[PDB]
Structure formats: structure tokens, C-alpha cells
Design a protein around this ligand. Sequence first.
Ligand code: GLU
Ligand code: GLU
Ligand code: GLU
Ligand code: GLU
Lengths: 328, 328, 328, 328
Amino acid sequence: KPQVTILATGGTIAGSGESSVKSSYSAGAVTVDKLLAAVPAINDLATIKGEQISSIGSQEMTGKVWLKLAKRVNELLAQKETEAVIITHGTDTMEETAFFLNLTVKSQKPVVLVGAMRPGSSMSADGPMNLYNAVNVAINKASTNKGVVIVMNDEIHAAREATKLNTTAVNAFASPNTGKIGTVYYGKVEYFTQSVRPHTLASEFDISKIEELPRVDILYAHPDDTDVLVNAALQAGAKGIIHAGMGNGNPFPLTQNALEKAAKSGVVVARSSRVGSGSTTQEAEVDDKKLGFVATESLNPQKARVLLMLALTKTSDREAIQKIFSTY
Amino acid sequence: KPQVTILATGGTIAGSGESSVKSSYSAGAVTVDKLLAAVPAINDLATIKGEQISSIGSQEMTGKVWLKLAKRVNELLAQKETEAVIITHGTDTMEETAFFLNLTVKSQKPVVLVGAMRPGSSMSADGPMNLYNAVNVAINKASTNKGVVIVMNDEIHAAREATKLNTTAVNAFASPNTGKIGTVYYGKVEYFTQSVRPHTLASEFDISKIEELPRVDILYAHPDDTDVLVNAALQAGAKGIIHAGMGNGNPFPLTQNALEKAAKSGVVVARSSRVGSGSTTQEAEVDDKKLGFVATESLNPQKARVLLMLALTKTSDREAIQKIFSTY
Amino acid sequence: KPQVTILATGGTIAGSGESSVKSSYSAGAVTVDKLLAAVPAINDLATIKGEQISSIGSQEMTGKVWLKLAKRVNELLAQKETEAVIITHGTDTMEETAFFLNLTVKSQKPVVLVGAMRPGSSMSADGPMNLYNAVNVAINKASTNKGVVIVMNDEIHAAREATKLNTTAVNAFASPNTGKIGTVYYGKVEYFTQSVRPHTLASEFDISKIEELPRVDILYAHPDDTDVLVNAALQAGAKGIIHAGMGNGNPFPLTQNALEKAAKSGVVVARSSRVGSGSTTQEAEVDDKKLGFVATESLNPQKARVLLMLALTKTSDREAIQKIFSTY
Amino acid sequence: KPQVTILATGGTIAGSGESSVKSSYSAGAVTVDKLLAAVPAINDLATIKGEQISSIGSQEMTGKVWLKLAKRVNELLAQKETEAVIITHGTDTMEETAFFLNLTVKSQKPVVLVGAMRPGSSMSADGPMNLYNAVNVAINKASTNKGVVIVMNDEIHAAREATKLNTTAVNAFASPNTGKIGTVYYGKVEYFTQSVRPHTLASEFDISKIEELPRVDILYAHPDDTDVLVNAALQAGAKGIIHAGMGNGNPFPLTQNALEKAAKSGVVVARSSRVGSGSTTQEAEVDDKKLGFVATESLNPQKARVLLMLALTKTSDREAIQKIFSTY
Ligand SMILES: N[C@@H](CCC(=O)O)C(=O)O
Ligand SMILES: N[C@@H](CCC(=O)O)C(=O)O
Ligand SMILES: N[C@@H](CCC(=O)O)C(=O)O
Ligand SMILES: N[C@@H](CCC(=O)O)C(=O)O
């Protein structure tokens, strides 16, 4: 049977309350033992080990955890015995963790993030099925070299494209620019597409010696906008700013002036959009070359932040970072 | 024939270049004369007058223009001869202006906002059809008391529900929580639903004596978030803050602490979400009553901002503002 | 506590296996007693009675059952004590039953259809939550006069607009032309819109003395299409034919000729579309007046069939039936 | 400059009326000359030749035209000088022609289908931009080996996945199971995914010596369904039947019995769904092995028809055809 490690970043996504008997197997983490008791069919698919990487809600995630998780995933996947890793994660920032891993995991072996929009105690909890399906995706031959994937609601989403698009629905995850790459229905895995943007083993980024990521703030644009938030990000040591602009990444004039000053000072300014989908394009209304900005193209603000953070580990050159956004 | 006024807030959304002859009719604004020359079929539907309210891209909109536009719309709709108003508007912030008007226009006569995702000079420009359709909606008997509507891409969207959800597509407008309320296809208007949330003549808000709206900032949440943007909004005199939270309106802890301090100081803190759709609900993970926050429910950050601005013209009381979010 | 009757048309949508003790309450139908044991929170919301109207999968539904169900719903809602009816139903044809009821139930009291995309025995079964939410919708004050609604996946869909749009997903139901009219999240009910098309108490249709509905067939259009299926429907006594046409309701020429002959013979031919959404419009490529056809407008083939069946209970006049499609 | 041939299957999708001067260039077909006059920017991108393959609306398409078009595309793409083919096509059945070509074109050179939801004479006609974008996609280096694509509304759709899902919208094309594979915005082409299902040069099908395709009918399921349409398809010599079932491909019992008889007689019965999206799966409620049916999985009825037609040129064996549906 294939060997898989489940890494938990918080509590159980499946089941609730104490175990009905004390297990003879220790997977390596109590959270994971609870998952194996709550979804026992997964034991027939794989030999499961468990680790607890963090113990937080995903809204409390930090770069320090991202680095710890990525370094551990790389170690695990370098082992001959380990076929895949599954990470259980809160849904709120799952997309940011998945995208970070998609650029930092140096392996073609599957890495699957999974969570639950309803708590395990709830009526009609989604976690048990989502986890069962995640294991099936992780052990599937066709999952190799698909990049980091999010598995939710019977769907397989590429990390580059995935986002949480709804506050509460079980079907909150979507890939608004491309769609799911595959499906998983009662464990039956089928892929229909794959990303043509480089990831994982093909990514230039390497975080193995990084202990802290560069600070990148995100700003929300609107009518009658301000310069004070740009100024405060500068004052706090921001190395980059994502601007979630109006429509196709457009700033309000006062804010544009402050961002221009930021970029002149050596802080990378990258234009995204508040709208939810589509590309924040080059050569539209904003003269990025003249102003010293980068266009994030077909991402969203929070994933653009992750990419800008990685880019800033090695360069602040506007052209090099535009090429990064135009590649990954 | 019905009398309609078109109010322009920027340039022409239809046609391009100089007129092929100097018209004998002056509608009242050069922009509108250019529209009538570009889309002549509209002259057979209505007697059109025109005014230029502002001359800006929608990303440069301000509360001063909103107040001027709302006051003029109210004057026009009080006239017995005026059956409807159409407003040509940039797409970027059309949703904000429409929502503002939906709560400040004291009339059941139709108010239609309309724009173009492609410039009038473009191949396959969408403005001409959008405008033609907008006129048809404005004069239709069934458009009375539907509230302010956005007419784009053959669809009629209720202002409360509409948003721009794509950076570049002609079909960028959506109503992600409810759908379009009607269709307009080569001028044929059909309504299938209407909003049950109060608007227009039923709204408590009145801006007739207001010269400046309350300052409301918006913040974009993410992992490893900060307190410095909250602090800078306070320092700049913010009367409210919309927090675009992670998932179902969740803040990062450092930011939550700053927002709690803000709320205690009498700055209203309203929780929305960065995700795109769904309600930012009460009684989920955030204890709003204990922390002193409002849950914006089924809006998005930029429209919640509008509603919080209007609320702040009347009150800063947490319970009263929650009731406003729970009503409108 | 409000009194509600649950009518079951098949098996349990929630729970699985035998009861853990023999209940002291008999709701009136074993299926319903099993539902109350599987979702016990519903007993705190309402006094529930149960009946078994049929015992079938929804793919085996027939007009005979539709008539039995509608007549019973009308009887129940005429009782002073009965506040609402919930019907548990298979998902496959739930939209057809809901639409039929929306035109035949002569009451403003709520009628809610609910089902489950996963069996009650499944991991992460959706039935328990869907039922819980259905009860909450049924007892909600704002549900009065909303027409027949489908409650699935935390959403409230108007019967006129609802369809099953996916083969397996828990979120398979949608209203592709208008969206959900409301939401229901852990029992909290909110409406955002309502239908402006007449239903229920305002419908002209009355089935109280009808024992069999008129035969209406549906045909699926494609390239290199045929006349033999039109001919066989005629031969079998079809009173009406829905043609699920290519694009905006377009037939292949051989098929068009056969439909023209059908319409001349007194069989009503109504044009819908195979595409999934939008209106099959009048005055597009097909000259409906000349050919003797009706345009179904903003429905789909299966719901158009239901409406044509009801129309044919009293008329086969082309113009009267076009007015029916243009009204309901 | 790259050489491209445009093949027209009907009239012009761009421009309208007579030319303002008689061109000195003849592209080879009057339709294509009219396109070059309507969209002159395409002449700077490629050397265009034109041919008129057929002169019909897409709702009049037949297998004879498909065979002529596929054979001509194969000849053209075998020429060293020809870099790509573009096919102008009515929207109604574009998806069927694209899917057919995706399995019969033996080349990795780009094949792009393109049409217009509005006539060229219309206000805000979409043909010009669609065609301009189609040319850009056809000449793009990254379009090699993507399979046959549909380019509409600034989107690139894989032929396997594309469908027309709305009757009238300019954005009617979608890929409901996977999404667009790329974008094309004012000619700027970007791919984000590709199909992992074999196509074109990797397809087993070869139609070079085929003069007539096997007859395949499609049936629309509903409650109170019949056996007479199955029987009439058998009588007319159907070699396969696509059943557009209720929900996850479910038949009504009377119809199931007729289909079982059909299958026993050696007519292939393939289960799809009327719903719109999702897989019609194996091992759900229908015992395909016992009844002698194929499950079409993640297609729709009209594309399943195409694939079943091509399958029937090689085999009628149930297992072999299931493998074909499970591969392509
Ligand atoms: N909001 C929490 C709860 C769990 C969930 O929704 O996934 C988180 O993101 O961790
Ligand atoms: N972004 C500008 C350009 C026009 C448009 O996008 O509609 C505006 O919103 O006014
Ligand atoms: N297909 C069956 C099973 C139950 C379900 O999917 O709702 C039905 O429609 O009754
Ligand atoms: N229905 C016709 C008209 C053109 C169009 O809809 O694209 C066809 O498909 O050819």
C-alpha cells in the first residue's frame, strides 16, 4: 500500500468528540489518529503517518508557518518511501498556502490540501468526504506532476488558479479563470486538464535557507481613496505592495501618486484587482513602465502577494518581477 | 414620446471621433449629442435631454460627485415631465454609484446606469447596444419601482446585488448572490424577479442637506496581517472601517486587536469579506457584540462602504448600524 | 409551534438503517418517522405530520402522481391548522414537480421541495442539513406568497427558475436565468428577491377535476436530424411537442417540416432549446406565426413540457398558449 | 508572415453590405474577402487564403459536410506552407463540428473555430473582435498541439469541453466541466491549461475513406416517458442512441425496457444527461453491464453523439465503446 503523510495545521476537519476506543496504531499525531477513526476507509487505501505542523485557524497563518511547512514537505517527498503529502488546513487561507507550496516544493510527487467548510460536528459535515477524496487524489498515478492541488467538493483545483469564492458554501472553492483540472467522486479520480504554467520542480524559487519572508501589504481601492495606507505600509518596512485596484487594476489619483513615490523609493508596487476574476493587464489605462509598477495579470491580490513575496527574496527589479508574474 | 434625461459622468460610451454633420438639436450636453449621433435609434424611443454632471473616469469618483449626482437625479425625477434618468458611467465603480443612488433617490421612476467594457472606438464596442437597451429599460412600464438598475450585456441587475466581477470581459457584471432581475434583448425588456430589500422611496436616508460624506476606509485581510493600516485610517479621521476579511469575514489577530481599539474609540468597524460572494454572517467565529463590530451580511466590501457611509450620516451606534445592514 | 406536513414521494433522504428505539410518536408515515429520528432538531421547530404519497425514484414520476400530490397539497393547505407542506423528492425530476405545483397549488402558504444528492447512508450526506433548512424555510413568515420553492445546498430557488444543472454535485441545483431568491444557512432564512411571474393562488390552472394530463413529448435537436421522432410522437397521440432546439430554438430543416405538419394537424409545437439557459425568443430565425409554433421563452424543455401540459387541459390555440408562455 | 486558410461554412460573421471598393486581392472565396474588408487588421498578422466549404446555417449541418470539412482541413495542414486553419461557423452547432474535428484532424497545427452571436450588421456585433482574436490564436506558437479550439468572447475553449450554454448572450460559450484553457484579449494570447484527454494526432479515428457516418439519434428523458421514440430510431436504422437522461443519466422504466431491447439488437445505447454539466457515471443507479449500455461520462448529449458516431465506424462492442468514452 502507498505511504502518505498527513500534515495538520489545525484541528480535525472530520469527526467530533473523543474516540470510542483507544487505537493500537499511533500515526504520529493525535489529530491524524482522530481523522483515521472518523474516516476509516482511508486506512484501506494507504499507510498513513501524521504530523502536527501548527495548531491554528488559517486566518492566523504566518510566513513562519509557510516556511516550516514547505521545508517539511520537501524533506518528506525526498524520502523514497513517501508517495504523497496531504495537508489539512482551514479554508480561509488555503489558497495562499497552496500557492506558496506550488512555487517552493521541489518534487513532482502529489501535494494535496484539503479542509471543510462545515465543522466536523455539524450535520452534513463535508470533511469526511473531502478527506477521503483527498487521499484518493494523493495516491493516484495521474496526480504526479500536476502541481499542488486543492481537493474540495468532489473537485481538484490547481493551486495557481484556486480561490475561496464564497463565505459559507460547501462549494466555495473555484478556479474562476480556468476551472477545476479534475474531479474526484467517491474516490474515483479523473483529470481533464493540467496547468501549463511552471510549478513545483520547475519553479526557480528556493526557500530552504530563508527564515523570514519579505513584508508585502495589500491595499483595497475605492472611490475617494487615500494615500495614508500606502504611507503606513512604507513606514512599516513594506518591501512590496499589492494594490487591489478598481476594474482592470486602476487606482484613484491620490493613491496612484503615493504608489509612484513608493516605487521610486524601491518598494515594488504590483497592480491586481478587487473584482475577483480576469487578468490585471499590461498596456491598458495605467502606464506601468512610466510609473514603475508591475501588472499581476491572471492572479488575485492574495496570491499575487505570495508571488511578490517570493520574488522579493531575490530581486526588486521591476522588469524581472514583471517577467515572474508573466511566467508563473 | 417619453422624456428621459441622460446624465453623463465622463466621455461617450458609444461612437468615436467627430460628428459627420452639426446636429440642429442640442440635447443639452455635447457628450449626449454624440451618443444620439452614434445610436440614432434611441431618438425614436424617447425625447432625450442631456447633462454633463462630471467629466471623469469612474476610478476618480468621489463622494462630492455622488452627492451632486443624487441631488440632480432627485430634482429631475420630481418633475412631472421627466419619466426616467439614465446615467452613463465608467464600469469600474458603477456598482458603488448605483448602490448610493439606490438608497438616496426618493422616487419610483426608473434610474438606469450604463457603461461599456470596450471603448466606443473599439472593434465590437459594446456601448451602442448597452445604451440602446438602457433606454428601453428606462421607458418600460415594468421598470417602475424596481430600484436603481445597472443595464449591461443584455441583463438588468438590481443595484443592491450588482458588481463588476471581471477585469475585461463584456459580461463582467454579475449579481453573484441573486442573479439578474431581468433581461433586455435588442430592446425587449422582461423582468423575472425584483429585490425584496427596501430601496429608493422606501429608504430612510436623505442626502439633500449633506455636503460631505463620512470617511470610510477599506482594509484587505491576509495572513501575517498588520495593525498599521487600521491605525493610519484612525489617524486620518476615519468614521468607519470596512474590513475585507478572510473567508467568512475573519481577521488576523493583530488586526482584530487594532479594530477592537478602533471600535472602542467610536469608529464603526464593519466586517465584510475578500472572497467575492456570500454573506459575512453574524454569530460565526467572530464575537461581534463583545468586540464592538457590525456584520455586513450579503454585500461586498465596496458596497458595504457605501451603506456604512450613509449610516454614519445618522448614527454610529453599533446596534442601529447592524439593523441597517440587516435591512437594506 | 407551527404545524407542518411532510409528504414523502420515495424513501428517506436523511439517515440510514433501523431506528435505535421504537418512537412513541407516529407522524403518520414510517418514512417521516425515520426523518424525525435522523434529524431530531426539526421536532423543536414544528409539529410534524407525515404522509406517503408515492414510493418511487423521481425518474419514475408520472402525471398520475403529480395530480395526486397537487390535490393533496391543496387539501392540506386549506386546513386552518396546516401552516406549510414539505415534500421530500428525488432530485432528478424535482424541478418538474415543483413547477407543476407552482401552477396548481391554490394557496399562498409555503410549499417546499427538498432532496439529497448523496444517499442518507453516505459519508457527508447532504439530506440532514437540507431537510433541517427546508423546515426552517417552511415556517418562515417571509416564505408566504413566494410560490413553490426548492431548498437545497443552503439556497432557496423559485420553482419557475430552478433546475438540476449537474449530475452529481451537492450544489447541482441552480436558477440559471435569475439566481436563488434567498438563502438558508443553519436554519437562518433570508430572502433577497421574489418572482414577478404569477404563481400559485394567482395561476389560472385548476387540476382538481383532472384525472389524466395531456401527452407532451420532448425532442432533442442536432445536426443531421430526423422527422421520425416527430412522426412517432404524433402516432402515439401527442397533444403537444416540446422541441429542444439548437441554439435559440432552431430546428434542422427535415425536422422543421415534420413539426409544421404536426402543428397543422392540431398538435401544439413549442420551441425550447437544448443549450441550458436563456430565452427561446420570438421573432428570431424561426417564423413562429407562419409555421404555427409557440416560443417557450425563458424556461427549459422539461419545464416547458409541464406548462404546455397544463395549457392543453383547456386550449390548443397557438396564440392563447403563446400568451401563457409569455405570462408564467 | 504566417499563412493561414480561413474556411467558411456559411456567410460572413463580420461586416455587412457591399464592399466600398473592389479588392485587388482575391483570397479565394468571396466570404473571406468580405471578412478581410470588415476586419483589415488581420491582413497585417497573416497571409490569408479563403475557401467556401459550405453555405449553410449551423442548424442545417450534416455528417456529409463534417466529412468534407475534416478531409479538407487534413489536406491543408499537411501542406508545409499552411500554418493553421480557421473555420467560420454558426454558433448553434459549432461545438459538434469542433469536437468532430478534434478527433479526426491528424495534425498538431492549430485549428480554430469562430462565430458571432450577433449578426455582423448588428449594433455592437461581436464577429469582428472574435475573428481578429481567432487569427491571433491561430498563429500563436503556444497554440500548437492544444487540439481544436473555439475562440469566442476573448476566451479559448478546448473542443472537448466547449458548449453553447445560452440562447442569445455574446458570452454563451462555456466549458462547464473545466473552463477555458486560455484567453485572447485584443489579440494577446495566453494559455493557462491544456486538455490531458487525447486529441487530433493522438486520436485513433480516421475518416479519410468514410463517405457516410453511422446514424445516431438522441432522446430527451422526462417523467411519464415513452418507448415509441426508441422504437422509431430502431426502425429508421439507428446504429446508436444517446439517451439524455434525468439527473445522473437515469431513464424512465418504459424507456429503459426499450433501450435494453435496442442494445440487445446490436444498437449501441449510450447514457448521457439532460442536466448540462457533470459526468454521467458508471456504477451509479443503472447497471450498465447487465443492461448492455455505455456511460458517456463527462460529455453532453450532442458531443457524446459525435464520439459514438466515430466509435461506430470501428466497432459496436459495448466494452470497446465504454473504453473510448473513458479515454477521449
Ligand atoms: N475559518 C477557520 C475555520 C475552518 C474552515 O472554515 O476551514 C479556518 O480557516 O481555519
Ligand atoms: N476604467 C475607466 C474606463 C471605462 C470603463 O472601464 O468603463 C472607467 O471606469 O471609467
Ligand atoms: N435518482 C434518484 C435518487 C435520489 C436523488 O438523487 O435525489 C431520484 O431522483 O429519486
Ligand atoms: N443560428 C444560425 C445563425 C448564426 C449564429 O447563431 O451564429 C447558425 O448557427 O448558423
